[PDB]
Each structure stands twice: as structure tokens, then as C-alpha cells.
Write a protein that binds this ligand. Sequence first.
Ligand SMILES: CC(C)(COP(=O)(O)OP(=O)(O)OC[C@H]1O[C@H](n2cnc3c(N)ncnc32)[C@@H](O)[C@H]1OP(=O)(O)O)[C@@H](O)C(=O)NCCC(=O)NCCS
Ligand SMILES: Nc1ncnc2c1ncn2[C@@H]1O[C@H](COP(=O)(O)O)[C@@H](O)[C@H]1O
Length: 239
Amino acid sequence: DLFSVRMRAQKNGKHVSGAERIVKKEELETAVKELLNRPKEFDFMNVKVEKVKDFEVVKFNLKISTYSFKSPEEAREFAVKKLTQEGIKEEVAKKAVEILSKGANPKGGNMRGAVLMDIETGERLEEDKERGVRTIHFDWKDRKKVTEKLLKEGYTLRTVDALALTFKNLFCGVVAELCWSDDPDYVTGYVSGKEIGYVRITPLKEKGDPLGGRVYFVSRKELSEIIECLTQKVVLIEL
Ligand SMILES: CC(C)(COP(=O)(O)OP(=O)(O)OC[C@H]1O[C@H](n2cnc3c(N)ncnc32)[C@@H](O)[C@H]1OP(=O)(O)O)[C@@H](O)C(=O)NCCC(=O)NCCS
Ligand SMILES: Nc1ncnc2c1ncn2[C@@H]1O[C@H](COP(=O)(O)O)[C@@H](O)[C@H]1O
């Protein structure tokens, strides 16, 4: 018996925190305490506890690597390069980078979710270009174990969280992903795919840029199944 525990929190109408845990009932309360304690300041928080019907367990298997650069132009140049090692045409990879740096939300600011980009044509397939699509209903099978292991190998808690999210994306049929943070202080981003692994890349923006986002590279012929998988299928990831 599994329960999905989803938390989001706002402050001054702005989203400041959000997380999901999928656990056995005997750790339900523990998961709720953790997420309730997650944001520092908030004026509104919602928590959803949902009994899980079906779910799938999947074995994590991406290679991790790390790269440092001396300007965002050089980090984005490398980012485009790694993307074309997943068979993506260079101009498609470049338009992704172009969209994130110039503001992915057409009415200014960050999106509430990821761009779905046609691998072949670079065109944005998400219907709501302010909202995008959100990957949800994923968690590490044994998050306590995974967090301690990755911390001691030198990865941060943001790495722990982003890894589980990409791996679901790739399992759901996203070919490749580009991501850097919306938070102007954090400036590591990544690029991922089944062949290039999980590729951490610093810095993909200047420390002070408030723009970020994610671009998912998807084959249009699979768009409907991909969206269903990202947003509805329940996946536990086993390290
Ligand atoms: C937050 C999360 C748990 C979704 O929870 P949810 O309660 O089911 O959210 P809902 O779909 O019901 O959203 C309803 C409202 O809360 C929104 N909201 C939810 N998640 C949001 C997010 N990640 N960013 C901005 N707004 C968000 C509000 O925008 C509004 O959604 P709307 O755009 O559809 O109008 C999801 O983002 C998640 O799985 N996060 C874990 C991974 C992660 O964020 N890692 C960060 C480091 S990579
Ligand atoms: N669950 C999600 N699925 C897809 N995209 C997201 C999700 N959460 C955030 N994003 C996008 O990725 C950017 C970075 O988010 P974060 O990982 O929370 O810093 C955000 O500005 C959103 O545009």
C-alpha cells in the first residue's frame, strides 16, 4: 500500500517550495512532517495525500558527470554539444537554449513547468506556454538511503531531487532534457539523456539572472503517451 504525498507552498502569490514523497503508510506521517517543514516562509501551503493504485519500480542507471566553464556562453556552447550526442540537430538544441535564456514564459518570468520541444523541428508543443507540463508522481524507492549515499559522493540535495526527476522523464520517453534553475543564486544546470547520462554544467547563467526553465526533447508522434506518463504514471526509482 503506497500513498503519494504532494506539497506546494506560496509566498506573496509566488511559488517558493514543492515536493513529493511516495511511501508506505507506516512512513506517511514522517513524509508529511518533512514536507510541512520544507519551506522557510510561506503564506499558503497545500498537501495532498493520495492512495496509489498502480506503480512501477525502475532501476536507476544514468552515468553522472560534471563540467565547469568560465562563462555561460561557454557552458551553453557545451550544453548544445552534449545534446547533439543524443541525435538532436544542433539548431534544435540551440533554440532550446535560446528560449530559456530569453524568458520561456511569453508574459515574462519563468514557467510553472517544462517546454515540450519537437526534436525534429524545435517547435513548442505544450498548449499552455506559461504553465508547461509538470513531471510528478515519481520518487526514490528508498529516499533516505539514496540521499545519504549521494551526499557522501559529493552531490547536493538539489542533485538528489533533480536526478529522480530526469530519470522519470527519460523513462517516460523524453529523449533529452535541458535544465537550469530559476533561482538567481544557483547556477549549475544539467543536460541529460540515455546516452550522455546526467551531465552537470556550471554556469548556465550569470549569478543574478532570475530566468530559468526546462526543455524536454520529445518525438511528436509520441507526445500524448509522453504527457500521460509524465503526469499520471507512478514510478519508484531504485538506485
Ligand atoms: C509541486 C509538485 C509536487 C506538484 O504538486 P500539486 O499539488 O499536485 O500541484 P497542482 O498540479 O495541483 O497545481 C495547482 C497550483 O499549484 C501550482 N504549482 C504546482 N507546482 C508548481 C511548480 N513546481 N511551480 C510553480 N507552480 C506550481 C500553481 O501554479 C497551481 O498550478 P497551475 O499552473 O495548474 O495553475 C511537483 O512540482 C513536483 O513533483 N516537484 C518535485 C520535483 C522538484 O520540483 N524538484 C526541484 C529541484 S529539481
Ligand atoms: N515538476 C516539474 N516538471 C517540469 N518542469 C518543472 C517542474 N518544476 C519546475 N519546473 C521548471 O523548471 C524550472 C526549475 O525549477 P526548480 O527545479 O524547482 O528550480 C522552473 O522554473 C520551471 O520552469
